[PDB]
């Protein structure tokens, strides 16, 4: 699809078996999900922004359906405040700005 | 222009007269810049998202020229770990998502 951005641009997205809504965001790296079960070996680590850090849990090769585009790649997970897909996902489904 | 994802999105900006890069955000609702220096009137407000929140100052009505698009709109500033364009800015210049 195209995408205006009059409102957030929250997709669909399933990952780990279960359905979840998050936001295509073009200003975060890599991607970060609220809690939620993954199965399989993760690594603790840090990554900040504005407000400080978090702790998050980092699994590999995880893959994960975005708007009916499927992609495999890193995946965070912690405390959030909602659930990202960062540009190493969205290069992935082929996703571009346009002005 | 047409912009992929496989680098930062970010952009030349001139506000308050100066020159400032900047990321084009499709996951910040708001624009929220680098402590500078800008005119006028300003509010003191708080802002969150991962990590925790800062203090910023809410300044209305300025003039940004983004990648040679003239919007004019609120601009936060303060202790971001990089500068900002938001949706509030992206929607006056026309810009979407495509994939
Ligand atoms: C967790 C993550 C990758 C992004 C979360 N952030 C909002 C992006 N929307 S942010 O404001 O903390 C942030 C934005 C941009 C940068 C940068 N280095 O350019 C660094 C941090
Ligand atoms: C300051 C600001 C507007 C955004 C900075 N952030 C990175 C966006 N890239 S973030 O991770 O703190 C964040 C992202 C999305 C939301 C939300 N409510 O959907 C709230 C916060």
């Given at each position: 699809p195209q995408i205006t951005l009059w409102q957030?641009?929250?997709?669909?997205?399933?990952?780990?078996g279960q359905l979840?809504?998050?936001?295509?965001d073009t200003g975060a790296d890599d991607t970060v999900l609220e809690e939620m079960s993954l199965p399989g070996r993760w690594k603790p680590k840090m990554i900040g922004g504005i407000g400080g850090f978090i702790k998050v849990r980092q699994y590999?090769?995880?893959?994960?359906?975005?708007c009916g585009h499927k992609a495999?790649?890193?995946?965070?997970?912690?405390?959030?405040?909602?659930?990202?897909?960062?540009?190493?996902?969205?290069?992935?489904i082929?996703?571009?700005?346009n002005f």
């Amino acid at each position: 699809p195209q995408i205006t951005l009059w409102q957030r641009p929250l997709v669909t997205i399933k990952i780990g078996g279960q359905l979840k809504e998050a936001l295509l965001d073009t200003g975060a790296d890599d991607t970060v999900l609220e809690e939620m079960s993954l199965p399989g070996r993760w690594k603790p680590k840090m990554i900040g922004g504005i407000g400080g850090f978090i702790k998050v849990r980092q699994y590999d090769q995880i893959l994960i359906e975005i708007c009916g585009h499927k992609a495999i790649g890193t995946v965070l997970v912690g405390p959030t405040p909602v659930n990202i897909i960062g540009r190493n996902l969205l290069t992935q489904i082929g996703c571009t700005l346009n002005f």
